Scaffold this active site. Structure first.
Site, PDB file in Angstrom:
ATOM      1  N   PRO A 187      -9.356   2.401  -8.460  1.00 55.09           N
ATOM      2  CG  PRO A 187      -7.529   2.179  -9.908  1.00 55.09           C
ATOM      3  CD  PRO A 187      -8.332   3.233  -9.109  1.00 55.09           C
ATOM      4  CD  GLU A 188     -11.616   1.694  -2.695  1.00 55.88           C
ATOM      5  OE1 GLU A 188     -12.228   0.918  -1.919  1.00 55.88           O
ATOM      6  OE2 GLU A 188     -11.700   2.943  -2.616  1.00 55.88           O
ATOM      7  CE  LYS A 195      -4.059 -13.294  -1.588  1.00 55.77           C
ATOM      8  NZ  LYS A 195      -3.013 -14.057  -0.841  1.00 55.77           N
ATOM      9  NE  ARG A 255      -5.642   7.797   1.041  1.00 50.01           N
ATOM     10  CZ  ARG A 255      -5.842   6.567   0.567  1.00 50.01           C
ATOM     11  NH1 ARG A 255      -5.227   5.529   1.123  1.00 50.01           N
ATOM     12  NH2 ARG A 255      -6.644   6.375  -0.470  1.00 50.01           N
TER      13      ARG A 255
END
Length: 288
Positions: free
Chosen positions: A1-2, A57, A276
């Site tokens: 989900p980007e 958004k 990350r």
DNA sequence: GTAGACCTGGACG
DNA sequence: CGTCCAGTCTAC
């Protein structure tokens, strides 16, 4: 989900549920079955409600609903996908939320790790402030001022992963791919980027987000892959035309880029337990 | 800047 | 078995 996955998911949700009436929403498992979402009790007390829109958004998605007979009564369902959140037309594995529409219509949200979130509100004021916490949507906004990059003495990869400073929507795989394409070292500080590099980076942000959005099976919304290929795509970044017909990882989670150059799995961002992995190819990406 | 947590695996040895 | 790897918020 980007960004791109959330945008496409919203488009599919609009295709199948706009104009539909929601009669009930249930959390059968996960966090919200253990403790209900914020504003849940008030929301359920106001159903049924008609879905007017489903928008996004960056990585933030939301449903806008209203009572047909009382167009003033407007409700919102705030939704965050987390790392594994997915919407679907069928009750997949890890289903957490079940939305029941009229005429037996169903919508399901599954989330293996349960990092996704739900919030219910009937305050447009609050939704607006929420949207203002997010920078311009990299995919949907064609006129972002990325020159603001120069104001930050931070690694370009950090600035792009941030959802407010420059723009919203980019995640771990998109930034790695964008910097490789732009041939920019992830460690390079935004304040050290040339205007030439800036316009180049902007070009690739658009190219990569649009390519990702146009894809049918990158892998992070598998529960809607059949639907992905049965719906079109809004023409975002109209002037940009990706050559490939499907998004492909050039460096992300790769041992080497398409040409045999060594790919480093670097720990540039985060600390403690939020570190990350940034994938990049030193032979291609430099500080120039 | 540094550390941890939320929660559930998949892939690998 | 065990060891890595896989959006966002909180605290010293």
């Amino acid at each position: 989900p980007e960004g791109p996955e959330v945008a496409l998911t919203a488009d599919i949700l609009e295709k199948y549920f706009k104009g539909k009436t929601l009669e009930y929403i249930d959390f059968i498992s996960g966090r919200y079955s253990k403790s209900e979402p914020e504003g849940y009790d008030d929301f359920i007390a106001n159903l049924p409600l008609k879905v007017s829109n489903v928008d996004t958004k960056g990585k933030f998605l939301w449903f806008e609903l209203f009572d047909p007979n009382d167009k003033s009564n407007k409700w919102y369902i705030w939704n965050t996908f987390g790392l594994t959140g997915m919407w679907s037309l069928f009750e997949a594995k890890y289903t957490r939320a079940v939305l029941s529409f009229d005429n037996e219509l169903m919508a399901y949200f599954s989330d293996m790790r349960n990092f996704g979130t739900f919030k219910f509100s009937n305050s447009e004021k609050e939704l607006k402030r929420k949207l203002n916490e997010l920078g311009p949507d990299f995919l949907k906004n064609d006129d972002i001022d990325i020159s603001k990059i120069k104001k930050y003495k931070q690694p370009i990869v950090a600035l792009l992963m941030d959802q407010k400073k420059i723009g919203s929507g980019l995640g771990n795989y998109l930034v790695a791919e964008i910097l490789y394409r732009a041939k920019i070292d992830p460690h390079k500080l935004g304040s050290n980027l040339t205007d030439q590099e800036i316009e180049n980076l902007w070009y690739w942000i658009k190219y990569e987000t649009k390519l990702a959005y146009d894809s049918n099976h990158i892998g992070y919304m598998v529960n809607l892959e059949n639907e992905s290929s049965k719906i079109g795509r809004k023409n975002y970044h109209p002037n940009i035309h990706p050559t490939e017909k499907e998004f492909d990882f050039l460096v992300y989670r790769k041992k080497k880029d398409p040409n045999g150059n060594k790919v480093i799995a670097d720990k540039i961002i985060g600390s403690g337990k939020n570190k990350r992995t940034t994938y990049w190819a030193p032979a291609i990406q430099k500080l120039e």
